[PDB]
Amino acid sequence: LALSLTADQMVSALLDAEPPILYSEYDPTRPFSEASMMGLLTNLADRELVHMINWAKRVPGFVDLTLHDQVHLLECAWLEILMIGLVWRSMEHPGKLLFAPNLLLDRNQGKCVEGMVEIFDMLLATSSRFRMMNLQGEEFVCLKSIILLNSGVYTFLEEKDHIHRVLDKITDTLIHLMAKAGLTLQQQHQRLAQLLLILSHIRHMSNKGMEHLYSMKCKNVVPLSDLLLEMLDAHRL
Amino acid sequence: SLALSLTADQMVSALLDAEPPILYSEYDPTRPFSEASMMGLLTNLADRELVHMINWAKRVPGFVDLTLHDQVHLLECAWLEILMIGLVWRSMEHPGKLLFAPNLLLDRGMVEIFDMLLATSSRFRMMNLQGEEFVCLKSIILLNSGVLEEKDHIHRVLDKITDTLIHLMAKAGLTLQQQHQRLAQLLLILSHIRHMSNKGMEHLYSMKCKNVVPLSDLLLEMLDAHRL
């Protein structure tokens, strides 16, 4: 059970759960258009989602939930989850976003898609923030798990309590990692807060991205898969 | 400087004394059924609350050390989050209801947002959120709103507020494990508050386009900051 895992066991489970890094279908034989660029991001998301499901199923506590609650949490969090992964992957590529190894873009390329550059800039800045804080992989996996369990939790009592118990275990794990790294007790609470406040900014970015995706759909820029249509539907634009 | 030197107790005293009043609405009372008489009521209320909010932000330790530009940016980004956390705090005592104003107690596309706000109030009631914690969270919302020696200054002030939250938790007898857990619980609610503000801001923009409900010049200007 998730509640009987030690911090070290939680970290090991989450690290082993990590999804693979996928490549985009980038076609370097033609120039980008707004449509073709959006097409790459939605196609990449669509393939990543299948792997996200496999990952979520391995997040301690997630399999205890009903299918409806699992659906709800993923519907809520999917873009946040993609974006935290992006910002993580992009840390050691200052000024660029590593959507995939074959799709490493700077802000002038993001400019190709009308209305995407504000989001692009927020993502770059978030990546820089993680770089400055020297975010560790062990911290990153805790944060991504937090997003999955938290983003949809309030919009569902016993199921909720279980979820809140698992979230508490992840907090414990973060603090453990910080103590392990030699942070003072004060530094531990301060870094915990700094990391969790970044999650508010990731939510912000996801909401702005979701509104942008809805515009792309409603302007017939890109065809969305049936999965992305349903993911988008859940955000009720 | 001076805000980096306040004790936790003095931080708390400062924020408590800065608290704005709870304002009354124009709700008439029933006797008119709702239309966007309701949106009319909420936007009138917000507009009056905003003037108090601006004068409250000046009293949040650290805020007045920022440039006027940065002060403007933070309030433009945070204002609906701040209104909403106030609402949720006022509504703690009224299960299933939102106390927009003492005279305006509404129950349950605004329904999705009402439901989110109700859920947040319910979370705060479940956690027995304290007034001292509430005022720390509201200042965090102001300073964290959303997305660099002055970045360092905001970060130093944010650390001090975090220290103040933990101080309050320690005072209340919580173990270290419990303090860290509660701190995380509270800060994760801010993600949901951000979410609700984002949703709310889209409704406000839609209202602006429809031109039915009157929106103050200040509200129009706040809204405009969220679009460009």
Place this chain on the structure above:
Amino acid sequence: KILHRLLQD
């Protein structure tokens, strides 16, 4: 729901 099916696969 596609996601409902994917969670079971």
Place this chain on the structure above:
Amino acid sequence: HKILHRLLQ
């Protein structure tokens, strides 16, 4: 966006 600026002053 000048109203807020005036009010902060």
